[PDB]
């Protein structure tokens, strides 16, 4: 109110702003220190003789000859194989509900890794051995939303909070290559490469995704009901029947395990300049992008 105009009506009487009368904000440019004069000249802060003044100090970690500290400690595999471990950026239910209340993520359509990135909900670093997001249980009590979310990992309590409100949660695997394409599709459509089919999870991760308790995308659909009922009895909530809901057709929607996006089969070449999609007809190519 007053302060805004006070700084502009006071500028009307002052001289014109020009390249001469400019200055930096005080406190933003420290004075430079030069080895000149009585105070900073002579020895110039280096001391008297030794290796100190001559600039020949030993390397960092050298303790004068006795076995250094970083060498007399034994070796242990704290970081053995750190570059081959899988990482998952956590997504809390508080964060998800916060993104939904602001319109940055719409619950009317299926929520996947792409929609989260497009809404700045998460930041995936595939080059840093990231394999996706893990749905954590923080904020489960206040969470109130009916969504169809796909997350690479999910805890038993986070699932119950989403299945209590009438939603569906599924766990799917994206390899490092597909994970970079799902997060940033546009930079991939500028490479003129056909959409590749994502690979299956390694041997060690097949049990996780072939199990219904984890809502796996390669699990038997006939075992989900019994598993959905267990959490209801355990955590004391009445399992709702989504078949009656109007959004049921959207909740069931799931992508083929060999699929990357929704409605875009592997093998096609998106042409953004002309807004067209190219499909191969070769009998051999079709069999490669379908198996």
């Amino acid at each position: 109110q007053g302060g805004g105009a006070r700084a502009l009506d006071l500028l009307r009487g002052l001289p014109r702003v020009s390249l001469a009368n400019l200055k930096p904000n005080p406190g933003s440019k420290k004075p430079e220190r030069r080895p000149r004069g009585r105070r900073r000249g002579r020895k110039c802060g280096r001391g008297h003789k030794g290796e100190r003044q001559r600039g020949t100090r030993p390397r960092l970690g050298f303790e004068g000859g006795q076995t250094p500290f970083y060498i007399r400690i034994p070796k242990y595999g704290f970081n053995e194989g750190h570059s081959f471990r899988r990482q998952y950026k956590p997504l809390s239910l508080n964060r998800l509900q916060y993104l939904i209340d602001l319109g940055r993520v719409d619950p009317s359509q299926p929520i996947d890794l792409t929609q989260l990135v497009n809404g700045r909900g998460v930041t995936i670093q595939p080059l840093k051995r990231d394999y996706g997001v893990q749905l954590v249980e923080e904020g489960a009590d206040t969470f109130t939303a009916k969504v169809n979310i796909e997350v690479q990992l999910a805890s038993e309590l986070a699932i119950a909070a989403i299945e209590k409100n009438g939603g569906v949660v599924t766990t799917a695997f994206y390899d490092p290559r597909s994970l970079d394409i799902v997060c940033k599709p546009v930079p991939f459509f500028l490479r003129g490469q056909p959409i590749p089919k994502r690979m299956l999870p390694p041997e060690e991760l097949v049990p996780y995704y072939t199990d219904a308790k984890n809502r796996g995308y390669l699990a038997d659909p006939a075992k989900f009901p019994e598993a959905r009922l267990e959490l209801a009895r355990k955590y004391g909530y009445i399992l709702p029947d989504i078949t009656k809901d109007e959004l049921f057709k959207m909740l069931c929607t799931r992508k083929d395990p060999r699929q990357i996006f929704f409605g875009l089969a592997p093998g096609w070449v998106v042409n953004m300049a002309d807004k067209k999609i190219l499909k191969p007809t070769d009998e051999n190519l079709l069999k490669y992008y379908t198996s």
């Binding site: 970083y70 034994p74 990482q87």
Partner: protein, 95 residues
């Protein structure tokens, strides 16, 4: 230490620190005890008990180990089922 490499022009990491120490995101460094596998037949159970314990390092040590490593080893990681996940953050710490 190599402050400026001859090919990339950037600081290098001392790999003798990575094979012995673990850094928690908070800034703490964890190590083993020197001699937890040497001459256990002449040592007491009490001494052997505190020899196989993972202990912390001090300010002077941790400041050195941070200079001997690059920023890649100070980032926040989200490993799956990490045994040290709860130790990467301090609680009820003042001053």
């Amino acid at each position: 230490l190599t402050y400026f490499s001859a090919r990339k022009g950037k600081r290098k990491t001392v790999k003798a620190v990575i094979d012995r120490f673990l850094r928690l995101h908070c800034g703490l460094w964890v190590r083993r005890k020197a001699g937890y596998k040497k001459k256990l037949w002449k040592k007491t159970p009490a001494r052997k008990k505190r020899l196989r314990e993972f202990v912390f390092c001090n300010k002077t040590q941790s400041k050195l180990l941070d200079k001997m490593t690059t920023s890649f080893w100070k980032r926040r990681n989200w490993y799956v089922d990490d045994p040290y996940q709860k130790y990467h953050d301090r609680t009820n710490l003042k001053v």
